[PDB]
Amino acid sequence: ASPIGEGTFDDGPEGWVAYGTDGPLDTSTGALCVAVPAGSAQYGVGVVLNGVAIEEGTTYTLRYTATASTDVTVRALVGQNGAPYGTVLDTSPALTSEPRQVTETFTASATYPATPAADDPEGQIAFQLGGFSADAWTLCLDDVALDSEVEL
């Protein structure tokens, strides 16, 4: 029904959550900056955001600017959690001291409903911040949108 907001992290993380890190997320600037603790291997750290609007094979556009104090290249994408499952995003979120904006229109070949139920965790976003940067680093995204067909 409702997406996350065309251009998030512009004052608050909204719902984006990050596990395997220190305290909650930190923004206060206009970019969701999660603190990745060194040695973030093993179990692996990451960030998930439940609340997406995808259906069957529809068109979409992911736009986010991630930047890690270090040159870390983790994994980022999307999928469904709660049947019928199905991932449509498969890329590598590169990061570094410089800003790493991202812009690409992919055809969500799945369906991310919005029903917060026990056996129905709906679909969300998966950020694998584990098994990538050895030393300590972090991720700073900003303005993450994803809608089907939009002005241009």
Indicate which CATH number applies to the domain containing 138.
2.60.120.260
Could you please report the per-residue DSSP string of 88-137?
-EEE--B--SS-EEEEE--EEES-B----BTTB--EEEEEEESSS-SS-E
CA torsion through residues 47, 48, 52, 57, sign: positive
Domain that holds residue 116: 1-152
* Three-class DSSP labels, 136-149: CEEEECCCCECCCC
User: Which residues, in sequence order, are bridge partners of residue 17?
Assistant: 48
- Say if CB 134 and CB 23 are below 8 A apart: no
Q: Residue 103: phi, psi to the nearest 5? A: -150, 110
Residues 106, 94, 31, CA angle at the centre, nearest 5°?
Answer: 85
Tally the domains of the chain: 1
Residues 125, 86, 56, CA angle at the centre, nearest 5°?
Answer: 100
DSSP 68: -
> For residue 114, what are its two tokens?
């919005």
Method: NMR
